[PDB]
Amino acid sequence: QCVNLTTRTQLPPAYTNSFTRGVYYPDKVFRSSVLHSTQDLFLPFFSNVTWFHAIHVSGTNGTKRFDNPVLPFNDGVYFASTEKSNIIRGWIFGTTLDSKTQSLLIVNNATNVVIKVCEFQFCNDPFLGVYYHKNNKSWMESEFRVYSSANNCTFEYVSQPFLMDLEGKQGNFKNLREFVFKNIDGYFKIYSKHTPINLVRDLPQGFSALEPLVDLPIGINITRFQTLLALHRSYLTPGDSSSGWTAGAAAYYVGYLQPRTFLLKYNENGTITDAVDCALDPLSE
Amino acid sequence: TKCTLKSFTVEKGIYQTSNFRVQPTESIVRFPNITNLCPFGEVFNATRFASVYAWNRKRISNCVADYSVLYNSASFSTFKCYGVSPTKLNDLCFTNVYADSFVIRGDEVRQIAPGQTGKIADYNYKLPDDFTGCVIAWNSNNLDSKVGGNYNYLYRLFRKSNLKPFERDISTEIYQAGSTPCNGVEGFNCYFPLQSYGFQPTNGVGYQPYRVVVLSFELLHAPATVCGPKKSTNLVKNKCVNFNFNGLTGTGVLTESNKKFLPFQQFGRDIADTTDAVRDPQTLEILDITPCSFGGVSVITPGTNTSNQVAVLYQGVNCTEVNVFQTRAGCLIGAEHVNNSYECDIPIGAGICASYQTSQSIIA
Amino acid sequence: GNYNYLYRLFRKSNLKPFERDISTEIYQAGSTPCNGVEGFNCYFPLQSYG
Ligand SMILES: *[C@@H]1O[C@H](CO)[C@@H](O)[C@H](O)[C@H]1NC(C)=O
Ligand SMILES: *[C@@H]1O[C@H](CO)[C@@H](O)[C@H](O)[C@H]1NC(C)=O
Ligand SMILES: *[C@@H]1O[C@H](CO)[C@@H](O)[C@H](O)[C@H]1NC(C)=O
Ligand SMILES: *[C@@H]1O[C@H](CO)[C@@H](O)[C@H](O)[C@H]1NC(C)=O
Ligand SMILES: *[C@@H]1O[C@H](CO)[C@@H](O)[C@H](O)[C@H]1NC(C)=O
Structure with missing residues (x-):
């Protein structure tokens, strides 16, 4: 069912800077000790990227934030999830995000990859769910309330079963998962890096x-x-359905792409070491 | 040499007459391993089929469909294709294939065709206009036929009108063939389109059922996922041959390189965007595409007014791809290497000169 | 409809410019030796118009 979460602490958005990040391999060609100039959809260096987060402060009314809004998709999107736990799961795509057009669904719960393409019924907030106990003190999946329908699916990519940690460790973030989602006229190219x-x-x-x-x-x-x-949703925060929605520590960065020319330097083993924006400063030109 | 500078008498010197070029030997083609075979072995081979008005589709995408193992089976009745030839089918890539499952009776197999009318072709199914597909039929009396009366199948005896192209009317209501609607038991102004099909094991060929599967193709703007199987030859190394791995067509000598590509990088280019190394799809090995041996063919003549002997110079050849003198400028065939040293009469290159000395020959 | 007018529907390769083919050999469609019989994978190379 489509439950509507409430009791959320509203706050103005925050923006950060992309310190020379968002560079991916444009094609599948090996180049050794050369400087190639490629024109494609890259992330502009030193951009005003948007910063979303999700935390819950104890004490007073607090800062209980859970950021997951609908964001446009012009020519691409950059995604660098920085968190210590496994709060981030995946993304959804499409034009209207309803059961009237096709849509993409990439879930990564701790059972398998759930990459699917169908006409789902994505609610106004596709939650996920973990649950903690005291007799069997281990985190387990509890809810998968993302869609509430089924139609003529045109793709399915369930991967091998895996068992993640799904715990709620506290401390500094020690996992940087960067993603780049592109779409050139026939495909959905995903570039990942950890x-x-x-x-x-x-x-x-x-x-x-x-x-x-x-x-x-x-x-x-x-x-x-x-x-x-x-x-x-543990026992420490009880209540109604949309009452105990603690989120721990979580923060992902977004960012859009635009047609730019980059000068990529390839190492002698065939990996990129540095890049030039070619449109950022006269020295870069 | 005479034909080059439009004359029958050439002077002393070295003249460029033609270009040496090693011809390719084979046509090596290396495509990836055939995997993700389309499930065309379960649509045909099925325990229980469905009625003619229950043509369940089994759409398939992102697969490798071999339309040849189906044609060359010698177990079908009428492999009638439309829009595309019955052969050369595994050379075209389609977006998605639509299958059909229904059991028509005898002569009804001739009704599923572009521009044909009949009972099935107007009541249960209705094939559209020109469309790229094929018909696959085979004997159904073998296992489907029930010994003692086969009435499990159903057939719409009469419908209100003609069916729409690739439509399924599941409207099973008692049609009024007579007068004001009965709205009750059949028999008085009441006609159920679905009553029965009827079969018998003691029947011939024209009055027996048949399993027909109509494969429907599509060329939508979406990328062609359903592709034909690509064959693959062997791999001969250390020989200038033509290669086509995944589209990178060209000629050259495929040797073994010590480079270390990235797991996702397949090809490899040089400073001037020229392919120099590729990764074989089947076996993950990195090759080295070196250009086929070529060069210039020069002719050293002391003049037709002195002699008719000539020496050929193959510039940029190792004298293993053509007296044979291996110089730093090429292979000089037709001249002897002397240990003496004289003034330069005809320059060859890299400090080598040729002349005509005495019993007469050309010395390098 | 007349049936004298015929046209070729099955040939091994393409026809070179200004070439006449008056042969009536059975075209082997699949990998099945025809040996001069008409039927499956072995069709007559001519056809009327009407
Ligand atoms: C751009 O960056 C500045 C400084 O981080 C920030 O205040 C601003 O909100 C950002 N984005 C916009 C909306 O200009
Ligand atoms: C290249 O790879 C080799 C081993 O694969 C490694 O020893 C070398 O340091 C690498 N080069 C650099 C500088 O990345
Ligand atoms: C179907 O079954 C027959 C008999 O086992 C087999 O020869 C054939 O390969 C199978 N696949 C199809 C659909 O031809
Ligand atoms: C392709 O098949 C061969 C033979 O089974 C095997 O050795 C090779 O590892 C396979 N390669 C891929 C890409 O699966
Ligand atoms: C090519 O010529 C060089 C110089 O004579 C020689 O050292 C080398 O072994 C030759 N290689 C071949 C392929 O014969």
């Missing part, structure tokens, strides 16, 4: 190239998308 981190509430500086991950030939019109997160 690098360690030891930050708290900021985006790290450095050059990390994102490796290609999939080339789904699902021809659809995507203009809007929405992120999916998990809300821990």
Whole structure:
């Protein structure tokens, strides 16, 4: 069912800077010790990226935030989830996000990958669910309330079963999962990358190239998308259905792409080391 | 040499006459391993089929469909294709394939065709206009036929009008063939379109059922996922041959390189956007595409007014791809290498000169 | 409809410019030796118009 979450602490949005990030391999060509100039949809260096987060402060009324709004999709999107737990699950795509047009559904709960393409019934807030206990003190999935319908699905990519941790460890973020979602006239190209981190509430500086991950030939019109997160509901926060929606620590960054030319330097083993924006400053030109 | 500079008498010197070019030997083609075979072995091979008005579709996408193992089976009755030839089917890539499952009776197999009318072709099914597809039929009396009366199948005897193209009317209500609606038991101004089909094991060929599967293709704007199987030859190394791995067509010598590509990187180019190394799809090995041996063919003549002997120079050849002198400028065939040293009469290259000395020959 | 007018519907390769083919050999469609019989994978290379 489509439950409407409430008792959320509203706050103005926050923006951060992308310190030379969002660079992916444009094509599947090996280049060694060369500087190639490619014109494609890249993330502009030092951009005003949007910063969403999800935390719950104890004490007073607090800052109980759970950010997952509908964001446009012009030519691409950058996604760098920085968190210590496994709150982030996946994303949804489509044009109207209802049962009137096709849509993409990528879920990564701790049972299998749930990449599907159908006409779902995505609610106004596709929650997830984890649950803690005292007799069997182990985190387990509790809810999968994302869609409430079924139609003529045109794709299905359930992967091998895996058992994640799904716990609620406390501390500094030590997992940086970067994603780049593209769509060039016939496909949905996903570029992923995972690098360690030891930050708290900021985006790290450095050059990390994102490796290609999939080339789904699902021809659809995507203009809007929405992120999916998990809300821990233990015994410490009881109440009604949409009352105990604690989220722990979680923060993902968004960012759009635009047609730009980059100068990529390839190492002798064939990996990208640094890049030039070519339209950021006269020295770059 | 005479034909080059439009004359029958050439002077002393070295003249460029033609270009040496090693021709390719084979046509090596290496496509990835055939995997994700389309389930065309369960639509045909099915325990229980469905009625003619219950043509359940089994749409398939993102698969490798071999339309040849179906044609070359010698177990069908009428492999009638439309829009595309019955052969050369595994060379076209489609978006999605629509299958059909129904059991028509005898002559009704001739009704599923573009531009044909009949009982089934107007009541249960209705094939549209020109459309790329095919018909697959085979004997149904073998296992489907019940010994003692086969009445499990159903058939719409009469419908209100002609069916729409690729439509399924599940409207099972008692039609009024007579007068004001009966709205009750059949028999008086009451006609149920679905009564029965009827069969018998002691029947011939024209009065027996048949399992027909109408494969329907589509060329939608979506990328063609359903593709034909691509064959693959062997791999001969250390030989200038033509290669086509996944579209990168060209000629060259496929050697073994010590490079280390990335798991996702397949091809490899040079500073001037020229392919120099590729990854074989089947076996994850990195090759080295070196250009086929080529060069210029020069002719050294001391003049037709002195002699008719000539020496050929294959520039940029290792004398293993053509007296044979291996110089730093090419292979000089037709001249002897002397240990003496004289002034340069005809320049060859890299400090080598050729002349005509005495019993007469050309010395390098 | 007349049946004298015929046209070829099955040939191994394409016809070169200004070439006449007056042969009536059975076209082997599949990988089945015809050996001069008409039927499955072996069709007559001519057809009327009407
Ligand atoms: C751009 O960056 C500044 C400084 O971080 C921030 O105040 C502003 O909200 C950002 N975005 C907009 C809406 O201009
Ligand atoms: C390239 O890879 C080799 C081993 O694969 C490694 O020893 C070398 O340090 C790498 N080069 C660099 C600088 O990344
Ligand atoms: C169907 O069954 C027959 C007999 O086992 C087999 O020869 C054939 O390969 C199977 N597949 C199809 C659909 O032809
Ligand atoms: C392709 O098949 C061969 C033979 O079974 C096997 O050795 C090779 O590893 C396979 N490669 C891929 C890409 O699966
Ligand atoms: C090519 O020529 C060089 C110089 O004579 C020689 O060292 C080398 O072994 C030759 N290689 C082949 C392929 O014969």
